């Protein structure tokens, strides 16, 4: 045990290789430290302009994912022909050639039978090389059913930004320069979309920003905020609307952005209409109409009656935001907006970003910077045969675009995925049966509300193959397992991130020798499948790949799987390293430089870039969303009904003008409150790498970094008032029951829980995945699966699944 002599010491001499973490959609650029062929450490890539070396804590858990002792090392096929939660698949190992042979035979059979639309491709997580496997392969086979997970993620959170300022997408938040931060359910030092960067800056920002966090639980962010507002689930818009009301009454909207009364005097008097012609809007549209149709009556007293919030607090917040303008940013989380009527919470909260001028302003929020990253491979129309051209026109299996599923992504009826509803279409064979399914990087039985519907749906699919690292809950229903090389350590990919006023593009590259007989999901597997399909007489995918996906420098197709994996990334990133990207940001001299640095950074965001040129119907920031009216009109006309009839069919309260303005929708609730007296407050663990760290022992060892939670346990947190009411004590084994299901976990009493609610992390309750994540693999879960409690419901205007607000539960000791 003597200290080693200097020539033999090993500290600091290993190799750092760039990659990208995907524990969340922060998608941080990383470096992996490698010694003796093993990945030993993860750090933020210092070259990153978004986050630098800053990282959230989950980067370290990555090491227990690549070195997860329950990873698949071989393709497999089930030998039990029956599928179900109660059916052991009896997987046996097979070769890649045999596994793809089986899948290829099933695909080709569809085409021979002129039913290629009964193929479905399901995508969970992904990288920006996904276009081939997700879209091109699917359409060339002849199916419209490339089903992403977007609507179980955050599509409702895009409704406000899109229908108010033309951004079907996320924003970055200029915390370093903020003077007021208002968060409706966002917890950016634990989750949301740059945990590394917002953790870097949050504490420092408290010296110049006043921070209010509106969340039914005391989140980490609320614990480091000037005010925690413990909102009743589903009532966020009430506060957002009352703030806007007070801002008008007090005259403290941001005049350089919004405009002003022509004659100077503030004519907004509570309860009383104003002449539209008396106000001259600058970069906004609809302020006075919004006031006249609804906002004039959304007083602090009205809001206090609903929420219990002190009206003096509402007023003080509104005035503080007015004085901070335009250095004002309003965050919305999934919690606020992924509710059956949540489109209008996104709209109501985001309207404040326009009203106080924070949109595209210093201290405010704005979209990701432009980058030249390509996101699609070449068009495949020339490779579409008649079978495929007919199949891709079929209605999608998720029923998007029906009267009650407008799913108005980017203003289009049926424009958005309805991930959770694909299970319903499958299990009802409506519009038709799905006979062949390929799915990757997804676990919808666990991650979708009421995922037992996926149990049912998948048990009815003739043939399904799952591309996965682990045998997860979804995998249990597969005919074939196709083991994936781990995205962060064994894969070529490319991702992006936004924050700190920049957008970055980062590489994923293998940092270790491939552990097992796996293949990269988005490149090698579709390449190998295309070859197999060509061998069997359907060579359109193979020809498409070999003729269209060729090296950007040499023009040659890939010689083999491994070359193709890298080629997929080289092709899309060539604008960054082959061409001069100086106009957008960094100038890279070569592919090798891109790989060595691992990240490309844009120039800093040009403030006010979008002022006066939003991609809305009016080109204004729309308090009265003519953009949304046009989308609703298109949907209504498609179904030969009025817009009001669409609202009714989609179970919104809005009628007439209210469909197009920020307004109060009473939150949808499911179940009898007297039988189910508690509202579920679903949350993420700050150690969740989405649904993928429950098989990591370090996750459990540090689980109490989630405020109120308990190491090595799955707890539901109750206010002590409700603990006393229901006879619960810390550590009690409890059953939580909703109208649609139940789970068991343990009780924790915590004052950071709003009375009448129960705050519980999603992420445990696996019955598969691995030996640490489950009690008895395939049979008995560890902890409790939140989504078994959550009734299958939708924000029908966006297609989003609802995970919040509507879930009533009861609790008892087991």
């Amino acid at each position: 045990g003597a200290e080693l002599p200097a020539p033999l010491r090993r500290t600091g001499v290993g190799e750092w290789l760039a990659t990208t973490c995907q524990g969340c959609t922060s998608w941080c650029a990383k470096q992996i430290y490698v010694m003796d062929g093993r990945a030993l450490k993860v750090r933020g890539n210092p070259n990153s302009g978004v986050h630098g070396m800053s990282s959230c804590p989950r980067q370290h858990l990555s090491l227990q994912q690549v070195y997860d002792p329950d990873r698949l090392r071989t393709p497999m096929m089930r030998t039990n022909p029956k599928k179900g939660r109660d059916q052991d698949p009896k997987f046996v190992p097979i070769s890649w050639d045999k596994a793809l042979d089986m899948l290829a035979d099933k695909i080709i059979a569809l085409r021979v039978a002129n039913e290629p639309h009964k193929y479905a491709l399901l995508r969970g997580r992904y990288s920006h090389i996904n276009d081939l496997l997700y879209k091109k392969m699917t359409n060339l086979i002849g199916s419209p059913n490339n089903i992403s997970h977007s609507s179980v993620c955050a599509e409702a959170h895009k409704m406000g930004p899109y229908y108010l300022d033309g951004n079907w997408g996320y924003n970055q938040y200029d915390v370093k320069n903020a003077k007021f931060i208002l968060s409706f359910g966002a917890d950016p030092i634990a989750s949301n979309r740059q945990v590394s960067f917002y953790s870097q800056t949050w504490g420092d920002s408290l010296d110049h920003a006043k921070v209010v966090v509106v969340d039914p639980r005391l989140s980490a962010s609320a614990a480091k905020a000037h005010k925690w507002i413990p909102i009743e689930p589903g009532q966020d818009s009430v506060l957002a609307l009352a703030i806007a009301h007070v801002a008008l009454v007090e005259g403290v909207w941001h005049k350089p952005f919004v405009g002003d009364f022509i004659e100077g005097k503030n004519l907004f008097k509570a309860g009383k209409t104003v002449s539209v012609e008396s106000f001259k809007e600058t970069h906004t549209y609809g302020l006075v109409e919004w006031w006249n149709q609804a906002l004039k009556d959304y007083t602090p007293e009205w809001a206090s009656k609903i929420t219990g919030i002190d009206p003096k607090t509402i007023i003080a917040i509104a005035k503080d935001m007015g004085a901070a303008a335009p250095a004002v940013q309003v965050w919305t989380s999934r919690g606020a907006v992924m509710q059956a009527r949540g489109t209008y919470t996104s709209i109501s909260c985001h309207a404040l970003n326009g009203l106080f001028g924070g949109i595209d302003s210093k201290g405010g929020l704005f979209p990701g910077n432009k980058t030249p990253l390509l996101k699609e491979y070449p068009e495949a129309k020339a490779y579409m045969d008649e079978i495929a051209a007919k199949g891709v026109k079929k209605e999608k299996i998720d029923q998007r675009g029906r009267l009650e599923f407008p799913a108005l992504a980017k203003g289009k009826s049926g424009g958005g995925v309805i991930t959770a509803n694909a299970a319903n279409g499958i299990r009802n064979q409506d519009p038709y049966e799905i006979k062949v399914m390929l799915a990757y990087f997804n676990n919808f039985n666990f991650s979708n509300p009421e995922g037992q519907r996926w149990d049912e749906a998948l048990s009815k699919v003739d043939f399904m193959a799952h591309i996965t690292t682990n045998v997860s809950e979804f995998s249990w229903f597969a005919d074939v397992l196709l083991p994936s090389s781990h995205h962060m350590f064994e894969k070529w990919g490319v991702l992006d991130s936004i924050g700190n006023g920049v957008a970055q593009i980062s590489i994923q590259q293998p940092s270790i020798k491939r552990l097992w007989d796996t293949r990269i999901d988005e490149s090698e597997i579709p390449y190998m499948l295309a070859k197999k399909l060509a061998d069997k007489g359907f060579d359109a995918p193979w020809r498409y790949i070999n003729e269209q996906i060729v090296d950007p420098e040499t023009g040659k197709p890939a010689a083999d799987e491994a070359e193709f994996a890298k080629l997929m990334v080289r092709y899309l990133t060539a604008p960054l390293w082959k061409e001069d990207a100086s106009k957008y940001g960094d100038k890279l001299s070569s592919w090798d430089e891109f790989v060595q640095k691992g990240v490309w950074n844009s120039s800093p965001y040009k403030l006010e870039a979008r002022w006066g040129k939003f991609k809305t119907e009016t080109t204004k920031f729309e308090f009265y969303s003519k953009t949304l009216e046009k989308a609703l009109q298109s949907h209504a006309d498609k179904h030969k009904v009025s817009i009001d009839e669409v609202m009714k069919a989609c179970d919104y309260q809005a009628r007439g003008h209210l469909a197009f303005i920020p307004h109060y929708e009473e939150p949808y609730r499911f179940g009898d409150e007297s039988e189910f007296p508690l509202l579920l407050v679903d949350q993420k663990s700050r150690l969740n790498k989405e649904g993928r760290t429950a098989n990591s022992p370090w996750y459990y060892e540090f689980k109490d970094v989630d405020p109120g939670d308990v190491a090595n346990e799955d707890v539901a947190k109750f206010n002590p008032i409700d603990g006393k009411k229901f006879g619960l004590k810390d550590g009690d084994e409890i059953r939580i029951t909703s109208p649609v299901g139940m789970l068991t976990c343990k009780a924790k009493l915590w004052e950071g829980v709003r009375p009448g609610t129960v705050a519980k992390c999603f992420g445990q309750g696996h019955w598969a995945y691995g030996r640490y994540a489950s009690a008895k693999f395939g049979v008995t879960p560890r902890g409790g699966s939140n989504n078994d409690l959550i009734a299958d419901r939708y924000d029908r205007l966006s297609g989003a699944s609802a995970f919040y607000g509507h879930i009533r539960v009861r609790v008892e000791k087991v």
Partner: protein
């Protein structure tokens, strides 16, 4: 020389990244965390305060763990660090009783024993801890850091104690402690408290320093500055 650490609680977000980095750096057994924390929730709804205080060895000026160690295994080095010659540790646990801070762990369990399991959740399909060990060439766990062995056992023997070494092996190379590098907000800073110009020395003059249990008389050299939370407005 008196190396120590200043932790800025305003910058700290209570994420545990420092503690997880310590796991990867130092190959601590499952359940052993040299870096850990003390979290507290105070108040009744709605006036609730949550605080997280990162903890580690305080590398004390007057370390009782050193004074009681019967073998001299626990000792002070010339940087002021409390280090351990693990080879001389007889597992008497006297250091643990003497340390007021509960930062010492005893290896009653065979380290990394869970990696000896060769069972497979899907036979001949998924792998096993033992198989992953063989595949990667690791001795005890595929996550083991060989750098640790520069100055301390990479894998400690059963029946010895262990604790934060202030990443002495990294300091020897002129590098930072893993937990310092791992902190997203740069909340953790180390340096020589005997150098009045060091960042740590200046930080505790600029801000009121706080120590854990200074009443125990050990002269801890982890100093906490500022506040995790802020006073509620409105």
């Amino acid at each position: 020389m008196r190396l120590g650490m200043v932790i800025d609680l305003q910058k700290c977000v209570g994420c545990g990244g420092c503690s997880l980095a310590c796991k990867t750096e130092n190959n601590t057994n499952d359940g052993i965390h040299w870096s850990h924390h003390i979290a507290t929730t105070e108040g009744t709804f709605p006036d609730v305060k949550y605080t997280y205080i990162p903890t580690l060895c305080n590398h004390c000026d007057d370390a009782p763990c050193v004074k009681v160690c019967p073998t001299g295994a626990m000792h002070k080095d010339k940087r002021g660090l409390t280090l351990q010659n693990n080879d001389e540790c007889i597992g008497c646990k006297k250091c643990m009783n003497a340390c007021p801070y509960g930062v010492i762990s005893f290896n009653a369990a065979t380290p990394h024993r869970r990696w000896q399991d060769d069972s497979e959740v899907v036979a001949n399909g998924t792998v096993s801890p033992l198989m992953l060990l063989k595949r990667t060439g690791a001795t005890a766990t595929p996550n083991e850091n060989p750098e640790r062995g520069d100055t301390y056992p990479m894998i400690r023997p059963k029946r010895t104690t262990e604790k934060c070494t202030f990443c002495d092996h990294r300091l020897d190379k002129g590098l930072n402690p893993a937990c310092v590098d791992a902190c997203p907000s740069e909340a953790r800073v180390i340096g020589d408290l005997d150098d009045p110009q060091s960042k740590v020395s200046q930080l505790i003059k600029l801000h009121k320093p706080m120590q854990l249990k200074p009443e125990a008389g050990t002269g801890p050299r982890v100093f906490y500055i500022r506040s995790f939370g802020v006073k509620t407005a409105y």
